[PDB]
Amino acid sequence: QKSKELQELRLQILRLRNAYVKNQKILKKKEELAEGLHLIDFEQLKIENQ
Amino acid sequence: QKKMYIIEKQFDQSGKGLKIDEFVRVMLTHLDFDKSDVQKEDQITLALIDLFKEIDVNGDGTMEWEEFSDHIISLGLLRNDRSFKNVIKNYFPSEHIKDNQKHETPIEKIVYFDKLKYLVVLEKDSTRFKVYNANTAELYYEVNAHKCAVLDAEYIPDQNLIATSSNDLTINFWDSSFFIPKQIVSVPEIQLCMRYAKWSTQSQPTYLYTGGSDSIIHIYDTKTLKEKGTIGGWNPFFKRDSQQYGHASPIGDILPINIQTTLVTAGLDANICLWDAATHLPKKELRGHEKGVYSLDWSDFSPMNQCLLSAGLDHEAFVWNTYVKEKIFLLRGHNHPLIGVKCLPGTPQVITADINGMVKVWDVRNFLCM
Amino acid sequence: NKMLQKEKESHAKEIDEREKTIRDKGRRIYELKKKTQELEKFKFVLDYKI
Amino acid sequence: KEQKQEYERQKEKLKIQNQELRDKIDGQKKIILERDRTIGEKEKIIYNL
């Protein structure tokens, strides 16, 4: 029972950790500006910042 | 403009006007667009086919260079018209109008009596209201309206009266013909806002609605200038099964929308109770503001562009529809709490002002900071 | 009176619901107006950038 | 005679019920059709947009 219980714990920890990595990836990927033109907008905006 | 002559050359190459296919193909070769991308390829083809049909006056399916040049000429004249419609020229500072009277105290309120041209300014902590010119800021009379600080000064055209409400629990209606107080009426409570509502219907008497600290709109007929009714407000004493309709904070303003016969009351609780002025019951409660709403205007530029505009503790103005509960639009770019929203009559221009002297003039057709 | 009482009824809820549908379709009208306006400016912006 | 007068008000209330039940209802349909036409007009704007 203890081995099995730790085994489903390992299942849940692994799946939760994969969901974690995906959530940080989503958080980083949401860098798109808005709308609409998302990256090119501030790329040309970055051009003027230059 | 560089490929104008090249397009002219290719169009003349047809010799009988470019049909749909050659027309579109020539503008596809010449345009600064993505010919290889099917999306804009097809979209530009459709737009140019629409242009072709519009140019098609003879109906033969041929658009001559003559017709194309005439259409370009018409578009050039329209651009000459440097608004593309309804030129909304910027509000320049009045080089000819400025304050003249020595206001001994800070300006508290200013109600412009367009009917009288009496720009009655109620001075903060000043027992006299100085009525200037809205066109020249020329004070007519510095007359003691009441015994204490005055909150609101509204024109009752129904009796040619300037009603001034004071924290002394009094309302003084002064005959504008002589600026003498025609009638003084005592009230159990101080009304923070006091607006003359003359609803559109001929049979509805004009009501000076006064929203005091109790959130109850005390309704004074403009003839007798006396209270005759109280609208719903946050009244914990009246503990019964009646649904909570109204506001839990003192009435800041009362907006008579005579077109819709709606008394709009904006409260510190962020509610905007639309009361049926015919019944004074709640037709609705606009919500979405983060804090107390203080100023309300009614942009009536077009029936299809009608928008209530609400501002207050929120640093941005919410656009509201009588049917559509959700705020239609939100004017951005404001750095501080918006003093209010104005909808200039006869123009699509709505002015939203922050506390830091920053004003944005927006086109209700687009609600953009023109 | 009894026959007419059996007869009379209705249509107030229908009036209100039709007003509600007007409301919803005006909502969608303005939503699509805003979407079309958002997409219009990008056309000229991208022509200008090209 | 007093009984007749007493039942005259009953007859009057009965005619009141008759007319009330015969009353408009049609007036309430028309608002429905107006709102439907406005709904259809709004649909066209929605589709065009």
UniProtKB/Swiss-Prot annotation, chain A:
Disruption phenotype: Mutants swimming speed is reduced compared to wild-type with trajectories wavy and kinky. Cilia length is not affected.
Compartmental location: Cell projection, Cilium
Family according to the record: Belongs to the CFAP184 family.
Summary of the function given for this chain in its UniProt record: In complex with CFAP263, acts as a regulator of ciliary beating that connects radial spoke 3 (RS3) to the inner dynein arm (IDA) and the nexin-dynein regulatory complex (N-DRC). The complex is positioned parallel to N-DRC and forms a connection between the arch at the base of RS3, the IDA tail and N-DRC.
Subunit structure: Forms a complex with CFAP263; the interaction is required for functional activity in cilia.
Stated name of the protein: Cilia- and flagella-associated protein 184
Natural source organism: Tetrahymena thermophila (strain SB210)
Origin organism lineage: Eukaryota, Sar, Alveolata, Ciliophora, Intramacronucleata
Protein encoded by which gene: CFAP184
Residues of the full protein shown: 597 to 646 of 794
UniProtKB/Swiss-Prot annotation, chain B:
Residue intervals of the EF-hand domain: 43-78
Signal sequence extent: none
Residues reported to bind Ca(2+): 56, 58, 60, 62, 67
Compartments it resides in: Cell projection, Cilium
Renumbered ranges of WD repeats: 102-142, 145-184, 189-230, 246-285, 288-330, 333-370
Record family assignment: Belongs to the CFAP337 family.
Quaternary structure (record): Associates with components of the nexin-dynein regulatory complex (N-DRC) and the CFAP184:CFAP263 complex.
Protein purpose: Associates with components of the nexin-dynein regulatory complex (N-DRC), a key regulator of ciliary/flagellar motility, and might act as an inner dynein arm (IDA) hub or linkage.
Record protein name field: Cilia- and flagella-associated protein 337 A
Originating species: Tetrahymena thermophila (strain SB210)
Curated annotation (Swiss-Prot), chain C:
Residues spanning the membrane: none
Location(s) in or outside the cell: Cell projection, Cilium
Family: Belongs to the CFAP57 family.
Subunit structure: Forms a heterodimer with CFAP57C. Associates with components of the nexin-dynein regulatory complex (N-DRC) and the CFAP184:CFAP263 complex.
Physiological role: Associates with components of the nexin-dynein regulatory complex (N-DRC), a key regulator of ciliary/flagellar motility, and might act as an inner dynein arm (IDA) hub or linkage.
The name this protein goes by in its record: Cilia- and flagella-associated protein 57 A
Protein's organism: Tetrahymena thermophila (strain SB210)
Gene (UniProt): CFAP57A
Parent-record interval covered: 996 to 1045 of 1293
Swiss-Prot record, chain D:
Transmembrane domains' residue ranges: none
Subcellular location: Cell projection, Cilium
Protein purpose: Associates with components of the nexin-dynein regulatory complex (N-DRC), a key regulator of ciliary/flagellar motility, and might act as an inner dynein arm (IDA) hub or linkage.
Similarity remark: Belongs to the CFAP57 family.
Self-association and partners: Forms a heterodimer with CFAP57A. Associates with components of the nexin-dynein regulatory complex (N-DRC) and the CFAP184:CFAP263 complex.
Name this polypeptide is given: Cilia- and flagella-associated protein 57 C
